[PDB]
JSON list of C-alpha atoms and ligand atoms in Angstrom, two decimals:
[
{"chain": "A", "resi": 7, "resn": "UNK", "atom": "CA", "xyz": [-96.46, 27.54, 73.32]},
{"chain": "A", "resi": 8, "resn": "UNK", "atom": "CA", "xyz": [-94.48, 30.04, 70.59]},
{"chain": "A", "resi": 9, "resn": "UNK", "atom": "CA", "xyz": [-90.78, 31.72, 71.32]},
{"chain": "A", "resi": 10, "resn": "UNK", "atom": "CA", "xyz": [-88.97, 34.01, 68.89]},
{"chain": "A", "resi": 11, "resn": "UNK", "atom": "CA", "xyz": [-85.50, 33.80, 68.04]},
{"chain": "A", "resi": 12, "resn": "UNK", "atom": "CA", "xyz": [-83.38, 36.48, 66.44]},
{"chain": "A", "resi": 13, "resn": "UNK", "atom": "CA", "xyz": [-82.10, 35.86, 62.87]},
{"chain": "A", "resi": 14, "resn": "UNK", "atom": "CA", "xyz": [-80.68, 38.73, 61.70]},
{"chain": "A", "resi": 15, "resn": "UNK", "atom": "CA", "xyz": [-80.38, 42.58, 61.09]},
{"chain": "A", "resi": 16, "resn": "UNK", "atom": "CA", "xyz": [-82.75, 43.96, 58.47]},
{"chain": "A", "resi": 17, "resn": "UNK", "atom": "CA", "xyz": [-80.52, 45.55, 55.52]},
{"chain": "A", "resi": 18, "resn": "UNK", "atom": "CA", "xyz": [-80.69, 45.78, 52.20]},
{"chain": "A", "resi": 19, "resn": "UNK", "atom": "CA", "xyz": [-77.80, 43.59, 50.60]},
{"chain": "A", "resi": 20, "resn": "UNK", "atom": "CA", "xyz": [-75.99, 45.21, 47.66]},
{"chain": "A", "resi": 21, "resn": "UNK", "atom": "CA", "xyz": [-75.57, 42.39, 45.13]},
{"chain": "A", "resi": 22, "resn": "UNK", "atom": "CA", "xyz": [-78.28, 40.07, 46.01]},
{"chain": "A", "resi": 23, "resn": "UNK", "atom": "CA", "xyz": [-79.68, 37.20, 43.83]},
{"chain": "A", "resi": 24, "resn": "UNK", "atom": "CA", "xyz": [-82.50, 38.32, 41.35]},
{"chain": "A", "resi": 25, "resn": "UNK", "atom": "CA", "xyz": [-85.28, 36.08, 40.85]},
{"chain": "A", "resi": 26, "resn": "UNK", "atom": "CA", "xyz": [-89.11, 36.15, 40.10]},
{"chain": "A", "resi": 27, "resn": "UNK", "atom": "CA", "xyz": [-91.51, 37.64, 37.86]},
{"chain": "A", "resi": 28, "resn": "UNK", "atom": "CA", "xyz": [-94.07, 40.46, 38.37]},
{"chain": "A", "resi": 29, "resn": "UNK", "atom": "CA", "xyz": [-97.44, 39.18, 37.48]},
{"chain": "A", "resi": 30, "resn": "UNK", "atom": "CA", "xyz": [-100.71, 41.46, 37.34]},
{"chain": "A", "resi": 31, "resn": "UNK", "atom": "CA", "xyz": [-103.20, 39.39, 38.61]},
{"chain": "A", "resi": 32, "resn": "UNK", "atom": "CA", "xyz": [-106.75, 40.60, 39.84]},
{"chain": "A", "resi": 33, "resn": "UNK", "atom": "CA", "xyz": [-107.59, 39.14, 43.55]},
{"chain": "A", "resi": 34, "resn": "UNK", "atom": "CA", "xyz": [-110.47, 39.48, 45.78]},
{"chain": "A", "resi": 35, "resn": "UNK", "atom": "CA", "xyz": [-109.87, 39.51, 49.71]},
{"chain": "A", "resi": 36, "resn": "UNK", "atom": "CA", "xyz": [-112.23, 37.87, 51.93]},
{"chain": "A", "resi": 37, "resn": "UNK", "atom": "CA", "xyz": [-113.66, 38.29, 55.53]},
{"chain": "A", "resi": 38, "resn": "UNK", "atom": "CA", "xyz": [-110.98, 35.52, 56.51]},
{"chain": "A", "resi": 39, "resn": "UNK", "atom": "CA", "xyz": [-108.04, 37.47, 54.96]},
{"chain": "A", "resi": 40, "resn": "UNK", "atom": "CA", "xyz": [-107.72, 34.90, 52.10]},
{"chain": "A", "resi": 41, "resn": "UNK", "atom": "CA", "xyz": [-106.67, 36.14, 48.58]},
{"chain": "A", "resi": 42, "resn": "UNK", "atom": "CA", "xyz": [-108.52, 34.29, 45.77]},
{"chain": "A", "resi": 43, "resn": "UNK", "atom": "CA", "xyz": [-108.38, 34.94, 42.05]},
{"chain": "A", "resi": 44, "resn": "UNK", "atom": "CA", "xyz": [-111.30, 36.34, 40.49]},
{"chain": "A", "resi": 45, "resn": "UNK", "atom": "CA", "xyz": [-111.70, 35.72, 36.50]},
{"chain": "B", "resi": 17, "resn": "UNK", "atom": "CA", "xyz": [-85.49, 39.21, 76.67]},
{"chain": "B", "resi": 18, "resn": "UNK", "atom": "CA", "xyz": [-83.80, 40.12, 73.52]},
{"chain": "B", "resi": 19, "resn": "UNK", "atom": "CA", "xyz": [-85.75, 42.98, 71.99]},
{"chain": "B", "resi": 20, "resn": "UNK", "atom": "CA", "xyz": [-83.01, 43.98, 69.56]},
{"chain": "B", "resi": 21, "resn": "UNK", "atom": "CA", "xyz": [-84.40, 45.56, 66.26]},
{"chain": "B", "resi": 22, "resn": "UNK", "atom": "CA", "xyz": [-83.91, 42.72, 63.70]},
{"chain": "B", "resi": 23, "resn": "UNK", "atom": "CA", "xyz": [-85.33, 39.72, 61.74]},
{"chain": "B", "resi": 24, "resn": "UNK", "atom": "CA", "xyz": [-86.80, 36.78, 64.39]},
{"chain": "B", "resi": 25, "resn": "UNK", "atom": "CA", "xyz": [-87.93, 33.27, 63.99]},
{"chain": "B", "resi": 26, "resn": "UNK", "atom": "CA", "xyz": [-91.22, 32.08, 65.48]},
{"chain": "B", "resi": 27, "resn": "UNK", "atom": "CA", "xyz": [-90.81, 28.76, 66.91]},
{"chain": "B", "resi": 28, "resn": "UNK", "atom": "CA", "xyz": [-92.67, 25.84, 69.07]},
{"chain": "B", "resi": 29, "resn": "UNK", "atom": "CA", "xyz": [-92.09, 22.79, 70.48]},
{"chain": "B", "resi": 30, "resn": "UNK", "atom": "CA", "xyz": [-95.66, 21.74, 70.56]},
{"chain": "B", "resi": 31, "resn": "UNK", "atom": "CA", "xyz": [-94.94, 19.26, 67.71]},
{"chain": "B", "resi": 32, "resn": "UNK", "atom": "CA", "xyz": [-91.93, 17.17, 66.88]},
{"chain": "B", "resi": 33, "resn": "UNK", "atom": "CA", "xyz": [-88.79, 19.03, 68.17]},
{"chain": "B", "resi": 34, "resn": "UNK", "atom": "CA", "xyz": [-88.48, 22.71, 67.32]},
{"chain": "B", "resi": 35, "resn": "UNK", "atom": "CA", "xyz": [-90.44, 23.97, 64.60]},
{"chain": "B", "resi": 36, "resn": "UNK", "atom": "CA", "xyz": [-90.43, 27.14, 62.85]},
{"chain": "B", "resi": 37, "resn": "UNK", "atom": "CA", "xyz": [-93.97, 28.46, 62.12]},
{"chain": "B", "resi": 38, "resn": "UNK", "atom": "CA", "xyz": [-92.72, 31.95, 60.71]},
{"chain": "B", "resi": 39, "resn": "UNK", "atom": "CA", "xyz": [-91.05, 34.97, 61.03]},
{"chain": "B", "resi": 40, "resn": "UNK", "atom": "CA", "xyz": [-91.31, 38.62, 62.06]},
{"chain": "B", "resi": 41, "resn": "UNK", "atom": "CA", "xyz": [-89.87, 41.95, 62.69]},
{"chain": "B", "resi": 42, "resn": "UNK", "atom": "CA", "xyz": [-88.92, 43.74, 65.89]},
{"chain": "B", "resi": 43, "resn": "UNK", "atom": "CA", "xyz": [-88.50, 47.43, 65.35]},
{"chain": "B", "resi": 44, "resn": "UNK", "atom": "CA", "xyz": [-89.02, 50.34, 68.35]},
{"chain": "B", "resi": 45, "resn": "UNK", "atom": "CA", "xyz": [-89.60, 47.42, 70.74]},
{"chain": "B", "resi": 46, "resn": "UNK", "atom": "CA", "xyz": [-92.91, 46.18, 68.90]},
{"chain": "B", "resi": 47, "resn": "UNK", "atom": "CA", "xyz": [-92.79, 42.59, 67.53]},
{"chain": "B", "resi": 48, "resn": "UNK", "atom": "CA", "xyz": [-94.63, 42.32, 63.89]},
{"chain": "B", "resi": 49, "resn": "UNK", "atom": "CA", "xyz": [-95.59, 39.28, 62.25]},
{"chain": "B", "resi": 50, "resn": "UNK", "atom": "CA", "xyz": [-98.78, 37.89, 60.18]},
{"chain": "B", "resi": 51, "resn": "UNK", "atom": "CA", "xyz": [-101.98, 36.79, 62.02]},
{"chain": "B", "resi": 52, "resn": "UNK", "atom": "CA", "xyz": [-102.15, 33.36, 60.61]},
{"chain": "B", "resi": 53, "resn": "UNK", "atom": "CA", "xyz": [-98.51, 32.56, 62.21]},
{"chain": "B", "resi": 54, "resn": "UNK", "atom": "CA", "xyz": [-99.50, 33.06, 65.87]},
{"chain": "B", "resi": 55, "resn": "UNK", "atom": "CA", "xyz": [-103.60, 33.27, 65.82]},
{"chain": "B", "resi": 56, "resn": "UNK", "atom": "CA", "xyz": [-102.75, 36.12, 68.11]},
{"chain": "B", "resi": 57, "resn": "UNK", "atom": "CA", "xyz": [-101.44, 33.90, 71.03]},
{"chain": "B", "resi": 58, "resn": "UNK", "atom": "CA", "xyz": [-98.92, 35.24, 73.24]},
{"chain": "B", "resi": 59, "resn": "UNK", "atom": "CA", "xyz": [-95.11, 34.85, 72.57]},
{"chain": "B", "resi": 60, "resn": "UNK", "atom": "CA", "xyz": [-92.17, 33.98, 74.87]},
{"chain": "B", "resi": 61, "resn": "UNK", "atom": "CA", "xyz": [-88.87, 36.16, 74.28]},
{"chain": "B", "resi": 62, "resn": "UNK", "atom": "CA", "xyz": [-86.30, 34.61, 76.15]},
{"chain": "B", "resi": 63, "resn": "UNK", "atom": "CA", "xyz": [-87.28, 34.73, 79.91]},
{"chain": "B", "resi": 64, "resn": "UNK", "atom": "CA", "xyz": [-90.02, 37.46, 79.09]},
{"chain": "B", "resi": 65, "resn": "UNK", "atom": "CA", "xyz": [-93.17, 37.27, 77.34]},
{"chain": "B", "resi": 66, "resn": "UNK", "atom": "CA", "xyz": [-94.80, 39.41, 74.69]},
{"chain": "B", "resi": 67, "resn": "UNK", "atom": "CA", "xyz": [-98.40, 40.11, 74.78]},
{"chain": "B", "resi": 68, "resn": "UNK", "atom": "CA", "xyz": [-100.57, 40.77, 71.59]},
{"chain": "B", "resi": 69, "resn": "UNK", "atom": "CA", "xyz": [-101.42, 44.69, 71.35]},
{"chain": "B", "resi": 70, "resn": "UNK", "atom": "CA", "xyz": [-103.33, 44.97, 68.11]},
{"chain": "B", "resi": 71, "resn": "UNK", "atom": "CA", "xyz": [-104.32, 42.27, 65.23]},
{"chain": "B", "resi": 72, "resn": "UNK", "atom": "CA", "xyz": [-106.82, 41.95, 62.56]},
{"chain": "B", "resi": 73, "resn": "UNK", "atom": "CA", "xyz": [-107.54, 38.83, 60.55]},
{"chain": "B", "resi": 74, "resn": "UNK", "atom": "CA", "xyz": [-108.65, 40.47, 57.65]},
{"chain": "B", "resi": 75, "resn": "UNK", "atom": "CA", "xyz": [-105.24, 42.30, 56.98]},
{"chain": "B", "resi": 76, "resn": "UNK", "atom": "CA", "xyz": [-103.59, 39.17, 58.47]},
{"chain": "B", "resi": 77, "resn": "UNK", "atom": "CA", "xyz": [-101.29, 41.10, 60.76]},
{"chain": "B", "resi": 78, "resn": "UNK", "atom": "CA", "xyz": [-100.52, 41.08, 64.39]},
{"chain": "B", "resi": 79, "resn": "UNK", "atom": "CA", "xyz": [-98.34, 43.28, 66.58]},
{"chain": "B", "resi": 80, "resn": "UNK", "atom": "CA", "xyz": [-96.83, 42.58, 70.16]},
{"chain": "B", "resi": 81, "resn": "UNK", "atom": "CA", "xyz": [-96.19, 45.13, 73.02]},
{"chain": "B", "resi": 82, "resn": "UNK", "atom": "CA", "xyz": [-97.35, 48.23, 70.84]},
{"chain": "B", "resi": 83, "resn": "UNK", "atom": "CA", "xyz": [-99.06, 49.42, 68.01]},
{"chain": "B", "resi": 84, "resn": "UNK", "atom": "CA", "xyz": [-98.06, 48.57, 64.41]},
{"chain": "B", "resi": 85, "resn": "UNK", "atom": "CA", "xyz": [-94.82, 50.46, 63.61]},
{"chain": "B", "resi": 86, "resn": "UNK", "atom": "CA", "xyz": [-93.87, 50.00, 60.07]},
{"chain": "B", "resi": 87, "resn": "UNK", "atom": "CA", "xyz": [-95.23, 52.68, 57.67]},
{"chain": "B", "resi": 88, "resn": "UNK", "atom": "CA", "xyz": [-92.69, 52.08, 54.51]},
{"chain": "B", "resi": 89, "resn": "UNK", "atom": "CA", "xyz": [-94.58, 51.66, 51.42]},
{"chain": "B", "resi": 90, "resn": "UNK", "atom": "CA", "xyz": [-93.60, 50.10, 48.19]},
{"chain": "B", "resi": 91, "resn": "UNK", "atom": "CA", "xyz": [-93.17, 52.97, 45.25]},
{"chain": "B", "resi": 92, "resn": "UNK", "atom": "CA", "xyz": [-94.51, 51.34, 42.88]},
{"chain": "B", "resi": 93, "resn": "UNK", "atom": "CA", "xyz": [-91.70, 51.39, 40.65]},
{"chain": "B", "resi": 94, "resn": "UNK", "atom": "CA", "xyz": [-88.34, 49.84, 42.37]},
{"chain": "B", "resi": 95, "resn": "UNK", "atom": "CA", "xyz": [-87.34, 46.44, 42.80]},
{"chain": "B", "resi": 96, "resn": "UNK", "atom": "CA", "xyz": [-87.32, 45.30, 46.52]},
{"chain": "B", "resi": 97, "resn": "UNK", "atom": "CA", "xyz": [-85.47, 42.60, 48.74]},
{"chain": "B", "resi": 98, "resn": "UNK", "atom": "CA", "xyz": [-87.27, 39.77, 50.54]},
{"chain": "B", "resi": 99, "resn": "UNK", "atom": "CA", "xyz": [-85.36, 38.87, 53.78]},
{"chain": "B", "resi": 100, "resn": "UNK", "atom": "CA", "xyz": [-86.41, 35.27, 53.59]},
{"chain": "B", "resi": 101, "resn": "UNK", "atom": "CA", "xyz": [-85.90, 33.62, 56.80]},
{"chain": "B", "resi": 102, "resn": "UNK", "atom": "CA", "xyz": [-86.08, 29.81, 55.96]},
{"chain": "B", "resi": 103, "resn": "UNK", "atom": "CA", "xyz": [-86.65, 27.01, 58.93]},
{"chain": "B", "resi": 104, "resn": "UNK", "atom": "CA", "xyz": [-83.28, 25.94, 59.58]},
{"chain": "B", "resi": 105, "resn": "UNK", "atom": "CA", "xyz": [-81.43, 28.22, 57.43]},
{"chain": "B", "resi": 106, "resn": "UNK", "atom": "CA", "xyz": [-79.55, 31.25, 57.41]},
{"chain": "B", "resi": 107, "resn": "UNK", "atom": "CA", "xyz": [-81.13, 34.82, 56.84]},
{"chain": "B", "resi": 108, "resn": "UNK", "atom": "CA", "xyz": [-81.10, 35.65, 52.69]},
{"chain": "B", "resi": 109, "resn": "UNK", "atom": "CA", "xyz": [-82.16, 38.67, 50.74]},
{"chain": "B", "resi": 110, "resn": "UNK", "atom": "CA", "xyz": [-83.92, 37.95, 47.18]},
{"chain": "B", "resi": 111, "resn": "UNK", "atom": "CA", "xyz": [-84.34, 40.75, 44.89]},
{"chain": "B", "resi": 112, "resn": "UNK", "atom": "CA", "xyz": [-87.26, 40.96, 42.81]},
{"chain": "B", "resi": 113, "resn": "UNK", "atom": "CA", "xyz": [-89.63, 43.56, 40.99]},
{"chain": "B", "resi": 114, "resn": "UNK", "atom": "CA", "xyz": [-92.82, 42.97, 42.65]},
{"chain": "B", "resi": 115, "resn": "UNK", "atom": "CA", "xyz": [-96.06, 42.50, 40.24]},
{"chain": "B", "resi": 116, "resn": "UNK", "atom": "CA", "xyz": [-99.79, 43.78, 41.37]},
{"chain": "B", "resi": 117, "resn": "UNK", "atom": "CA", "xyz": [-102.67, 42.40, 43.45]},
{"chain": "B", "resi": 118, "resn": "UNK", "atom": "CA", "xyz": [-105.60, 44.29, 41.90]},
{"chain": "B", "resi": 119, "resn": "UNK", "atom": "CA", "xyz": [-108.75, 44.55, 44.24]},
{"chain": "B", "resi": 120, "resn": "UNK", "atom": "CA", "xyz": [-111.92, 46.05, 44.35]},
{"chain": "B", "resi": 121, "resn": "UNK", "atom": "CA", "xyz": [-110.47, 48.45, 47.04]},
{"chain": "B", "resi": 122, "resn": "UNK", "atom": "CA", "xyz": [-107.16, 49.33, 45.38]},
{"chain": "B", "resi": 123, "resn": "UNK", "atom": "CA", "xyz": [-103.69, 47.94, 44.17]},
{"chain": "B", "resi": 124, "resn": "UNK", "atom": "CA", "xyz": [-101.14, 46.14, 46.36]},
{"chain": "B", "resi": 125, "resn": "UNK", "atom": "CA", "xyz": [-97.68, 44.88, 45.23]},
{"chain": "B", "resi": 126, "resn": "UNK", "atom": "CA", "xyz": [-96.97, 41.45, 45.27]},
{"chain": "B", "resi": 127, "resn": "UNK", "atom": "CA", "xyz": [-93.97, 39.38, 45.20]},
{"chain": "B", "resi": 128, "resn": "UNK", "atom": "CA", "xyz": [-93.74, 36.04, 42.92]},
{"chain": "B", "resi": 129, "resn": "UNK", "atom": "CA", "xyz": [-91.62, 34.20, 45.12]},
{"chain": "B", "resi": 130, "resn": "UNK", "atom": "CA", "xyz": [-91.89, 30.90, 46.75]},
{"chain": "B", "resi": 131, "resn": "UNK", "atom": "CA", "xyz": [-90.70, 29.93, 50.26]},
{"chain": "B", "resi": 132, "resn": "UNK", "atom": "CA", "xyz": [-92.02, 27.33, 52.53]},
{"chain": "B", "resi": 133, "resn": "UNK", "atom": "CA", "xyz": [-94.89, 27.69, 55.33]},
{"chain": "B", "resi": 134, "resn": "UNK", "atom": "CA", "xyz": [-92.15, 28.43, 57.63]},
{"chain": "B", "resi": 135, "resn": "UNK", "atom": "CA", "xyz": [-91.13, 31.81, 56.27]},
{"chain": "B", "resi": 136, "resn": "UNK", "atom": "CA", "xyz": [-94.39, 33.50, 56.56]},
{"chain": "B", "resi": 137, "resn": "UNK", "atom": "CA", "xyz": [-93.74, 37.20, 58.11]},
{"chain": "B", "resi": 138, "resn": "UNK", "atom": "CA", "xyz": [-90.48, 37.72, 56.59]},
{"chain": "B", "resi": 139, "resn": "UNK", "atom": "CA", "xyz": [-90.12, 41.01, 55.69]},
{"chain": "B", "resi": 140, "resn": "UNK", "atom": "CA", "xyz": [-90.03, 42.88, 52.16]},
{"chain": "B", "resi": 141, "resn": "UNK", "atom": "CA", "xyz": [-87.52, 45.89, 52.18]},
{"chain": "B", "resi": 142, "resn": "UNK", "atom": "CA", "xyz": [-86.96, 48.87, 49.93]},
{"chain": "B", "resi": 143, "resn": "UNK", "atom": "CA", "xyz": [-83.63, 50.19, 48.98]},
{"chain": "B", "resi": 144, "resn": "UNK", "atom": "CA", "xyz": [-83.31, 52.09, 52.19]},
{"chain": "B", "resi": 145, "resn": "UNK", "atom": "CA", "xyz": [-83.98, 49.13, 54.25]},
{"chain": "B", "resi": 146, "resn": "UNK", "atom": "CA", "xyz": [-87.46, 49.74, 55.59]},
{"chain": "B", "resi": 147, "resn": "UNK", "atom": "CA", "xyz": [-89.98, 47.20, 56.08]},
{"chain": "B", "resi": 148, "resn": "UNK", "atom": "CA", "xyz": [-92.70, 48.08, 53.30]},
{"chain": "B", "resi": 149, "resn": "UNK", "atom": "CA", "xyz": [-94.55, 44.62, 54.56]},
{"chain": "B", "resi": 150, "resn": "UNK", "atom": "CA", "xyz": [-94.40, 40.99, 55.25]},
{"chain": "B", "resi": 151, "resn": "UNK", "atom": "CA", "xyz": [-94.23, 38.03, 53.12]},
{"chain": "B", "resi": 152, "resn": "UNK", "atom": "CA", "xyz": [-96.66, 35.42, 53.41]},
{"chain": "B", "resi": 153, "resn": "UNK", "atom": "CA", "xyz": [-100.50, 36.04, 52.60]},
{"chain": "B", "resi": 154, "resn": "UNK", "atom": "CA", "xyz": [-101.30, 35.42, 48.65]},
{"chain": "B", "resi": 155, "resn": "UNK", "atom": "CA", "xyz": [-102.28, 33.05, 46.19]},
{"chain": "B", "resi": 156, "resn": "UNK", "atom": "CA", "xyz": [-101.13, 30.00, 44.25]},
{"chain": "B", "resi": 157, "resn": "UNK", "atom": "CA", "xyz": [-101.28, 30.05, 40.62]},
{"chain": "B", "resi": 158, "resn": "UNK", "atom": "CA", "xyz": [-101.99, 27.64, 37.81]},
{"chain": "B", "resi": 159, "resn": "UNK", "atom": "CA", "xyz": [-98.39, 26.98, 37.24]},
{"chain": "B", "resi": 160, "resn": "UNK", "atom": "CA", "xyz": [-98.00, 25.64, 40.78]},
{"chain": "B", "resi": 161, "resn": "UNK", "atom": "CA", "xyz": [-96.32, 28.89, 42.09]},
{"chain": "B", "resi": 162, "resn": "UNK", "atom": "CA", "xyz": [-96.86, 31.00, 44.92]},
{"chain": "B", "resi": 163, "resn": "UNK", "atom": "CA", "xyz": [-97.35, 34.82, 44.64]},
{"chain": "B", "resi": 164, "resn": "UNK", "atom": "CA", "xyz": [-97.46, 36.81, 47.86]},
{"chain": "B", "resi": 165, "resn": "UNK", "atom": "CA", "xyz": [-99.20, 40.17, 48.81]},
{"chain": "B", "resi": 166, "resn": "UNK", "atom": "CA", "xyz": [-96.67, 42.87, 50.07]},
{"chain": "B", "resi": 167, "resn": "UNK", "atom": "CA", "xyz": [-98.85, 43.14, 53.35]},
{"chain": "B", "resi": 168, "resn": "UNK", "atom": "CA", "xyz": [-98.55, 46.27, 55.14]},
{"chain": "B", "resi": 169, "resn": "UNK", "atom": "CA", "xyz": [-100.38, 47.60, 58.28]},
{"chain": "B", "resi": 170, "resn": "UNK", "atom": "CA", "xyz": [-100.93, 50.98, 59.43]},
{"chain": "B", "resi": 171, "resn": "UNK", "atom": "CA", "xyz": [-99.16, 53.13, 61.92]},
{"chain": "B", "resi": 172, "resn": "UNK", "atom": "CA", "xyz": [-101.58, 55.35, 63.81]},
{"chain": "C", "resi": 1, "resn": "7HS", "atom": "C1", "xyz": [-96.77, 31.16, 55.53]},
{"chain": "C", "resi": 1, "resn": "7HS", "atom": "O1", "xyz": [-97.22, 30.74, 56.52]},
{"chain": "C", "resi": 1, "resn": "7HS", "atom": "C2", "xyz": [-97.38, 30.65, 53.63]},
{"chain": "C", "resi": 1, "resn": "7HS", "atom": "C3", "xyz": [-95.94, 31.04, 53.07]},
{"chain": "C", "resi": 1, "resn": "7HS", "atom": "C4", "xyz": [-96.44, 30.52, 51.99]},
{"chain": "C", "resi": 1, "resn": "7HS", "atom": "C5", "xyz": [-96.08, 29.08, 51.72]},
{"chain": "C", "resi": 1, "resn": "7HS", "atom": "N1", "xyz": [-96.85, 28.52, 50.47]},
{"chain": "C", "resi": 1, "resn": "7HS", "atom": "C6", "xyz": [-96.11, 28.62, 49.41]},
{"chain": "C", "resi": 1, "resn": "7HS", "atom": "N2", "xyz": [-94.90, 28.68, 49.17]},
{"chain": "C", "resi": 1, "resn": "7HS", "atom": "N3", "xyz": [-97.08, 27.89, 48.32]},
{"chain": "C", "resi": 1, "resn": "7HS", "atom": "N4", "xyz": [-98.60, 31.43, 53.78]},
{"chain": "C", "resi": 1, "resn": "7HS", "atom": "C7", "xyz": [-99.43, 30.53, 53.91]},
{"chain": "C", "resi": 1, "resn": "7HS", "atom": "O2", "xyz": [-99.35, 29.38, 53.72]},
{"chain": "C", "resi": 1, "resn": "7HS", "atom": "C8", "xyz": [-100.76, 31.87, 53.54]},
{"chain": "C", "resi": 1, "resn": "7HS", "atom": "C9", "xyz": [-101.63, 31.48, 54.73]},
{"chain": "C", "resi": 1, "resn": "7HS", "atom": "C10", "xyz": [-102.71, 32.77, 54.80]},
{"chain": "C", "resi": 1, "resn": "7HS", "atom": "C11", "xyz": [-103.72, 32.69, 55.62]},
{"chain": "C", "resi": 1, "resn": "7HS", "atom": "C12", "xyz": [-104.64, 33.97, 55.55]},
{"chain": "C", "resi": 1, "resn": "7HS", "atom": "N5", "xyz": [-105.51, 34.12, 56.41]},
{"chain": "C", "resi": 1, "resn": "7HS", "atom": "N6", "xyz": [-101.45, 30.98, 52.53]},
{"chain": "C", "resi": 1, "resn": "7HS", "atom": "C13", "xyz": [-101.56, 31.61, 51.25]},
{"chain": "C", "resi": 1, "resn": "7HS", "atom": "C14", "xyz": [-102.46, 31.02, 50.48]},
{"chain": "C", "resi": 1, "resn": "7HS", "atom": "O3", "xyz": [-101.23, 32.51, 51.31]}
]
C-alpha cells in the first residue's frame, strides 16, 4: 500500500545546473503507453 | 492528510524498508503522477486516503481527488527545469533545452536527463514555475542514455 510524502515546493531555480542535449527522435507510442524508436 | 501544493514522493513499505516508487505533483487539491507509478491504485496521505479520479494507460497519467489540473505547455523554444526528486535525496532543479519526440500524431518535447526509476512523475517546469509535464515515460537510446517525453495531460 502506497503513501505520499511532501518533498518541496515547485519553483524555478535561478542558477540551476544545466545538463543534457536536445535530441530529435522519431518515435511511436503503442496502446500500452510505451514509446519505441522508429527507423 | 497534507494537501499543500508541491512535489511529493510516492512511497511503499511492501518491499524491504520503505521504497520510493515515484513522484507526483499536488496542485489545486489534485494529486498528479504517471500511471505506471501507481497502476491506478488508491494512495494514503497521512491519515487520509486519496482515491483515483482519472487515468489513461496510453498517456501514462493518473490524477487523484479530482480531474487533471496541469495545463501549461512547453513553448518549444525555451529551456525548462526538471524538479527531480531522487530516492533518499533532496529535490533538485536541473535545467535543459528539450529535444523533440516526432510522432504520427504530432511532436512532443523530450528531456535528455537520466534519473533512476524512483524519479518517475517528477515535474518539468517552465520559467514561470508552471508544470508543463511529468518526467518518466520515454526511450532508452543507443548510447545507453534515457530520454523522457514531457508528458502533459488535458485540463477539462
Ligand atoms: C520511472 O518509473 C522511470 C524513469 C526512467 C528510469 N530509467 C532510466 N533512467 N533509464 N520510467 C520508466 O522506467 C519507464 C516506464 C514507462 C512505462 C509506460 N507504460 N520506462 C521508460 C522506457 O520510459
